[PDB]
Design a binder for these strands. Sequence first.
RNA 1: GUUAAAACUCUUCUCAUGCUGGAUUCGAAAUUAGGUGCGCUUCGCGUUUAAGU
Length: 234
Amino acid sequence: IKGILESITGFSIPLDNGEYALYPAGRHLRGAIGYIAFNLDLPISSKFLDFDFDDIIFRDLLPISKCGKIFYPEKNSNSLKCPSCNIYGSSVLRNIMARGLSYKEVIEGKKYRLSIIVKDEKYLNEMEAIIRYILSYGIYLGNKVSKGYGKFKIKEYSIVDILPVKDSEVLLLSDAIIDNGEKDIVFSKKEISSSKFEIIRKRGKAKGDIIRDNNHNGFYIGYGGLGFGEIISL
RNA sequence: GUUAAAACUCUUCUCAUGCUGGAUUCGAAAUUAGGUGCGCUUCGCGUUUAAGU
């Protein structure tokens, strides 16, 4: 499901070592949508509760550019540049000190990609319902969801077919998970109506690196899915 | 079912002070208290004395 999301209120997603990432990741999208499906008792909730399901792949929200295409990551850096057009990064983070609380927030108004993929007919009605909900009443990503930070309304919704990358020469669009990886990817898995919190920290490989690997792992999928690692045709 | 949830950039501070709607210009110009009506009516300078010796 290809789409364009526009932020009217900005978002704040933190990382470790006092960094905040440029773009909202697909793990945040997933967590928001699974909350939203919980609030509407949609039949897929239990599956968003599971961190393993790979049928629905919520990719990462990547900043679209003036080109209209998707900005692509750059190895050994903290920015993304439309190969089509000469950069997104380290100029949209904005330092915020609010009644004691000091954090960082990525400024609003920029347009990001809403590209999810659905490999079964079991959800087209369900996703439809979630995009319809995201359309009429918005979605929220990041911190301070109940304070209105992270407002994200749709700007475009197209149900357009998708096909895997018929290339073993693939560039990592986002942070893949490998057993001996160097970038520690940290995320979390709450459990509402159970009061359970956990911080999932797993090693893996960073984005913007070309991988010469004949596996091809379906469409992207590096191994976590549910966000995590993506790939693009080089 | 988002390394989440939680937590209001809040509190203090008067657009205030200085400056006069003042200066110039005459309620003036034209018009006669004028027109009508008589100080009139009533009341004899009388009374008294020989041009004589």
